[PDB]
C-alpha cells in the first residue's frame, strides 16, 4: 500500500503542497490541485465544502485516517492541518492515493 507519512513528507520536500481548508477549496476551484487530502475530523461544514469543490472539479479526495492534529504533526507544523492540496507531487507517489482513474 502507499506509505502515507513517507509519501506525504516526500511531496512536501520535493513537490508543492498547499495547506489548509481555504487553500484546498481554492485550488480545487481553479483546478490547480491534483489530489486533496482531508483529515477524517475536518470540521463537518468545511469538510462538506472541500468535498463539494473537489467533486465539482473532478479532483480526487483522500481521507486521512487521522485527526487534524496528527496531520499537522505529520507535516511538521505546530498547528492543526484539516486538509491540503497536492499541487505537485514532486518525486513522491502521493497521487496514487487518488485511485487509478
Numbering used by the authors: 0 to 100
Source paper text:
For example, we have shown that the thermophilic ribosomal protein L30e from Thermococcus celer has a ΔCp value of ∼5 kJ mol−1 K−1, which is much smaller than the value of ∼10 kJ mol−1 K−1 obtained for the mesophilic L30e from yeast. To study the contribution of charge-charge interactions to the thermostability and the reduced ΔCp of thermophilic proteins, our group had systematically removed 26 surface charges on T. celer L30e by single charge-to-alanine substitutions. We used the double-mutant cycle to investigate the effect of pair-wise interaction of two salt bridges (E6/R92 and E62/K46) on protein thermostability and ΔCp. Since thermophilic proteins tend to have more salt-bridges than their mesophilic homologs, our observation that salt-bridge reduces ΔCp may provide a general mechanism for enhancing thermostability - thermophilic proteins have more stabilizing salt-bridges that reduce the ΔCp, leading to the up-shifting and broadening of the protein stability curve.
As a negative control, we have also used double-mutant cycles to study the pair-wise interaction between E90 and R92, which have a long separation distance of 10.8 Å. The crystal structures of the E6A/R92A, K46A/E62A, and E90A/R92A variants were determined at resolution ranging from 1.8 to 2.0 Å. The structures of all these variants can be superimposable with the wild-type structures. The root-mean-square deviations (r.m.s.d.) between Cα atoms of the wild-type L30e and its variants were <0.5 Å, suggesting there were no major structural change in these variants. In contrast, the values of ΔΔGint were close to zero for the control pairs (E90/R92). The average values of ΔΔGint for the salt-bridges E6/R92 and E62/K46 were 2.3±0.3 and 3.9±0.3, respectively, while the value for the control pair was 0.6±0.3 kJ mol−1. On the other hand, for the E90A substitution that did not break any salt-bridge, there was no significant change in the value of ΔCp. On the other hand, for E90A substitution that did not break any salt-bridge, the ΔCp value was 4.0±0.1 kJ mol−1 K−1, which was similar to that of wild-type L30e. The values of ΔΔCp(int) for the control cycle, E90A/R92A(M), were close to zero (−0.1 to −0.3 kJ mol−1 K−1). In contrast, the ΔΔCp(int) was close to zero for the control cycle E90A/R92A (−0.2±0.4 kJ mol−1 K−1).
